[PDB]
């Protein structure tokens, strides 16, 4: 028995299987930032900090003695609750195949958006810095019309080539930019093919961020340390509802500051 306390919930095995399948299917679609960064294997719930390797000077305990203190990055935990109806839970054993899992889908969407925002733009409250605020290249503004994106992509590629960064290049775009690209010309495919023609990678859709960016997936530039992966826990229940939650714990680090180019939203 662990902290999740799953056995105390009045939920059948088939309902648990269906809920797990739905949650996994939703997370695999709404988890975007995990595909472009290095992800380590889970290390357990006892992980608290990751050493950076740097030190800071200290005054000194006694005369003739000098002291330094190591620097670390902390681990942060996220939890999102939701509620499920007991009638829908019980109908699974009766033979239902269309039970309502919309609150679970919404919770998965929220946790995925939170993780993506934390990775891409940082979490100042927890002391975690993002990739875009630490990027050292010159940001480029996106054009108003969808027909002028390839020249900006080419400018970003030129910046990367001048800086000297190799690897397959991937373009991450926000919802507004993705819709602007898709809803133009003959369905947006000629623009899509132009972008995939300049860059060997694939355009990635990220709903939780604004603007966009271009990065490389050569490896060794972004590290994500995961203590506990996304899991389901049990809080309480009433005569008609059961409250559950999703939880995870991780930390993130961006090593190379010249491997990405920031794309600001159009004016």
């Amino acid at each position: 028995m662990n902290n999740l306390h799953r056995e105390l919930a009045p939920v059948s095995d088939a309902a648990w299987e269906q809920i797990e399948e739905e949650a996994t299917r939703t997370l695999k679609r709404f988890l975007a930032a995990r595909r472009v960064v290095d992800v380590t294997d889970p290390q357990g719930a006892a992980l608290s900090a990751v050493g950076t390797g740097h030190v800071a000077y200290l005054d000194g305990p006694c005369a003739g003695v000098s002291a330094v203190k190591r620097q670390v990055l902390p681990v942060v935990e996220f939890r999102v609750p939701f509620k499920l109806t007991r009638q829908a839970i019980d109908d699974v054993e009766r033979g239902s195949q269309d039970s309502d899992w919309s609150p679970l889908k919404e919770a998965a969407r929220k946790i995925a958006a939170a993780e993506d925002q934390t990775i891409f733009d940082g979490y100042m409250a927890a002391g975690i810095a993002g990739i875009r605020p630490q990027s050292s290249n010159t940001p480029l503004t996106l054009p108003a019309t969808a027909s002028d994106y390839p020249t900006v992509v080419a400018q970003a590629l030129d910046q990367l080539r001048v800086a000297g960064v190799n690897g397959p290049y991937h373009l991450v775009l926000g919802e507004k930019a993705y819709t602007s690209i898709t809803g133009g010309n003959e369905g947006g495919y000629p623009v899509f093919q132009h972008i995939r023609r300049l860059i060997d990678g694939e355009i990635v859709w990220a709903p939780a961020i604004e603007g966009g960016l271009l990065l490389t997936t050569r490896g060794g530039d972004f590290v994500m340390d995961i203590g506990q992966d996304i899991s389901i826990g049990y809080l309480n229940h009433t005569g008609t509802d059961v409250e559950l939650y999703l939880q995870e714990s991780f930390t993130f680090s961006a090593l190379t500051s010249e491997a990405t180019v920031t794309l600001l939203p159009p004016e």
Binding site: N2, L4, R6, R34, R35, D38
Partner: peptide, 10 residues
């Protein structure tokens, strides 16, 4: 228990 294995989505 309840891991919900996702890992890397590469």
């Amino acid at each position: 228990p309840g891991s919900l294995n996702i890992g890397s989505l590469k």
